[PDB]
Amino acid sequence: EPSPYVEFDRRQWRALRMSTPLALTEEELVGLRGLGEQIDLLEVEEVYLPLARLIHLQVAARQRLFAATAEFLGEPQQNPDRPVPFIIGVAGSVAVGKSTTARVLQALLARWDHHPRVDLVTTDGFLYPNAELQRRNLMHRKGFPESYNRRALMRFVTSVKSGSDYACAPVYSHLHYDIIPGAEQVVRHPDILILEGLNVLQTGPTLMVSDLFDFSLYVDARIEDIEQWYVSRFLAMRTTAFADPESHFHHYAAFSDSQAVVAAREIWRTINRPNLVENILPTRPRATLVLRKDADHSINRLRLRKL
Amino acid sequence: EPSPYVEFDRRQWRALRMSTPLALTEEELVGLRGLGEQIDLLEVEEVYLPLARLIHLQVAARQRLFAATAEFLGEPQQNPDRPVPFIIGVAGSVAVGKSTTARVLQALLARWDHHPRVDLVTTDGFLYPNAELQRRNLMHRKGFPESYNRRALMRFVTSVKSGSDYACAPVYSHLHYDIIPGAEQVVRHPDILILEGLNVLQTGPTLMVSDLFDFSLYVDARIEDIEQWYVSRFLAMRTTAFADPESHFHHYAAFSDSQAVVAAREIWRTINRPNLVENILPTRPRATLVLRKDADHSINRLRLRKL
Ligand SMILES: CC(C)(CO)[C@H](O)C(=O)NCCCO
Ligand SMILES: CC(C)(CO)[C@H](O)C(=O)NCCCO
Ligand code: NA
Ligand code: NA
Ligand code: NA
Ligand code: NA
């Protein structure tokens, strides 16, 4: 029967790359990928290039219908480029590779002829401070929708897409596990803004940032493989991030493989799995494009929304 | 601060009419309006004409971005006109005038040069049969989201927008208060499809018809005035619809003004008000355009979504 989606295997999807030129070195790609991730230039060629093409086709088009409303409203046509910013949402579970996906994507789009100003903002900066989470009793629901200042977030994206010259976002420290006092990420009328986070695709009784997305990605994989990736990476960090004496999780650095597995498995089932099942996965149906990864992190399937 | 919306008063909105020609007689308009409604040609000139213009500007534009995805996919350009159907959602409370709004709109759009095939479908046809509602114990939640076969509904709209040649919808009898056995409304690849219903703008954990709307209307008024309109019309029907011996509500025809008011007030607070507050109003933020009516049914304010 009819469907709003059209599935692709990697063979079918890579052919849609066309002439899209690869503007990324092997060394540039590594400073973009996170611990555990297996993304290489082949994947950036057979997957991210078609995606970048599809995106560029729609930036021009998306611009046409904001112009229709401008024409209808008896309005000018504000400086070119200073068209309406194209907002892209990248969602998915913790440890699924979505932040790398978002970084790679910002890289590819920034290297487009025109030379678009492409900004990337993670929702981390929009988490409530630990003190405020403690107050609302949310220190163990960090990542759940309620642990974010969604008002501020919505104001931020609304501000950018409405044409503001500059919008500020708080900044989150992973080293300190908390929001950084005084820190701000300033976004200045970018041509494209990618917003990456766990629940960005969420919907509700009020207008949310998902309602401002012109395009969205949902990096998917089966729950069991993601837990494995999460646990694996938790263990690997004992010698990277947790090794830092200043790390809020420095006590984990000394855990044994077995002790670390138990700890990582517990956080997964008490925080990350529940959030994935209750809040993140239910948003997957609305994503313009879903990137399905196999147990080895390899993106071998895609689901696109034609309707 | 920045906003996704831009408010208008009738003076500001009527000026956006431009050259839009009025193709509707006074007599045509009456066979389109419901009991109690006060819509006249002036309102169709100062309100529905700008709306029809704005809509036409976007049908062309909306077409551009379905073409981008076609271009990207290495596809042809299917027969012209046989472009992708433009889906319009019209929501709002029972008795707010939304069905008239939808009928007037279908009329105005059908009379556009090209001569678009403009179909209108009410979600009534998608209510579960009384027998099935009795089974799920829903005979008094008729109108609530759960009293509708949303799967079938979604399949219907998906079918039409995906390019099907014909799609069928069940038919609801207001005379008999139930779905009509064997009846079907056949929709054949229209250029525009207007879907009118209480919860059409609803959102959820699955892709819904609201996600297929290219444009949506939400006819609004303050809850107190709508109850008044509902009650008033309930009383007026004693001599129109309830007067019919075959009417499922023929017992109401003999009620006294006071008896009828008590009955109408009870249905309003036990079914229609709760549904309006819990399910319909929460969808209002997402409507492309909101038509705000004053206590006298007069549309004197509009809220448009620019973002
Ligand atoms: C969502 C995020 C990862 C943001 O940093 C948050 O810190 C979190 O998930 N806390 C519980 C442990 C997850 O590793
Ligand atoms: C929603 C609809 C009006 C559809 O006909 C439904 O019959 C209903 O609202 N029943 C309760 C009484 C409302 O008058
Ligand atoms: Na990382
Ligand atoms: Na903000
Ligand atoms: Na009517
Ligand atoms: Na159906």
Secondary structure, 3-state, A11-74? HHHHHHHCCCCCCCCHHHHHCCCCCCCCCCHHHHHHCHHHHHHHHHHHHHHHHHHHHHHHHHCC
Nearest CA to B280 among B64, B11, B91, B29?
B91
DSSP state letters, A82-129? -SPPEEEEEEE-TTSSHHHHHHHHHHHHHTSTT---EEEEEGGGGBPP
DSSP code of A78? -
Nearest CA to A303 among A290, A294, A287?
A290
DSSP code of B243? T
Minimal Cβ distance to B203: which of A16, A71, A203: A203
Q: How far is the CA of A122 from the centre of ligand 3 (A)?
A: 12
Residue B74 touches partner A, C-beta closer than 8 Å: yes
Helices and strands of chain A, counted as H and E runs:
10, 9
Instruction: Tell me, using a 6 A CB cutoff, whether residue A248 lines ligand 1.
Output: no
Strands B86-92 and B192-196: parallel
Residue A3 touches partner B, C-beta closer than 8 Å: yes
Distance from CA of B136 to the nearest CA of A (A): 25
Strands B5-9 and B299-305: antiparallel
Q: In angstroms, what CA-CA distances link A36 with A194, A231, A235, A297, B184?
A: 23, 11, 11, 9, 56
Distance from CA of B127 to the nearest CA of A (A): 22
Q: How far apart are alpha carbons B184 and B199 in whole angstroms?
A: 21
Q: How far apart are alpha carbons B199 and B154 in whole angstroms?
A: 13
Angle in degrees, 0-180, between the axes of helices A48-72 and B48-72, rounded to the nearest 10: 160
Residue A71 touches partner B, C-beta closer than 8 Å: yes
Instruction: Tell which B residues from 36 to 65 touch A, by Cβ distance under 8 Å.
Output: 50, 53-54, 57-58, 60-62, 64-65
Angle in degrees, 0-180, between the axes of helices B257-267 and B223-236, rounded to the nearest 10: 130
Instruction: Tell me, using a 6 A CB cutoff, whether residue B283 lines ligand 2.
Output: no
| A95 labelled ligand-binding | yes
Residue of chain A whose Cα is closest to the Cα of B160: A2
- Residue found under tokens 């009118």: B196
Residue B69 touches partner A, C-beta closer than 8 Å: yes
Instruction: Tell which B residues from 107 to 166 touch A, by Cβ distance under 8 Å.
Output: 155, 158-159, 161-164
CB contact under 8 A, B211 and A4: yes
CB contact under 8 A, B164 and A2: yes
Token reading at A193: 């803004």
Residue of chain A whose Cα is closest to the Cα of B306: A69
Contacts of A69 in chain B (CB under 8 A): 54, 57-58, 304, 306
* Ligand 1, atom 1: closest residue by C-alpha: A143
Q: Are B154 and B106 in contact (CB under 8 A)?
A: no
CB contact under 8 A, A74 and B164: no
Q: Are B197 and B91 in contact (CB under 8 A)?
A: yes
Q: Are A85 and B29 in contact (CB under 8 A)?
A: no
CB contact under 8 A, B16 and A74: yes
Instruction: Tell me, using a 6 A CB cutoff, whether residue A92 lines ligand 1.
Output: no
Q: How far is the CA of A103 from the centre of ligand 3 (A)?
A: 10
Give me the residue spans of the domains in chain B: 1-307
Instruction: Tell me, using a 6 A CB cutoff, whether residue A124 lines ligand 1.
Output: yes
CB contact under 8 A, A57 and B74: no
Q: How far apart are alpha carbons A78 and A71 in whole angstroms?
A: 12
- Residue found under tokens 């105005």: B108
* Ligand 2, atom 7: closest residue by C-alpha: B142
Q: Are A63 and A83 in contact (CB under 8 A)?
A: yes
Residue of chain A whose Cα is closest to the Cα of B278: A205
**Is residue A305 helix, strand or coil?**
strand
Instruction: Tell me, using a 6 A CB cutoff, whether residue B272 lines ligand 2.
Output: yes
Q: In angstroms, what CA-CA distances link A274 with A124, A143, A223?
A: 19, 10, 11
Tell me if the domain spanning A1-307 has CATH number 3.40.50.300: yes
| A247 labelled ligand-binding | no
CB contact under 8 A, B53 and A72: yes
- Residue found under tokens 């200045």: A188
> Phi then psi for A259, rounded to 5 degrees?
-65, -40
Q: Closest ligand 2 atom, CA of B230?
A: 14
Greatest alpha-carbon span in chain B:
68
Give the experimental resolution in Å.
2.6
Q: How far apart are alpha carbons B289 and B1 in whole angstroms?
A: 20
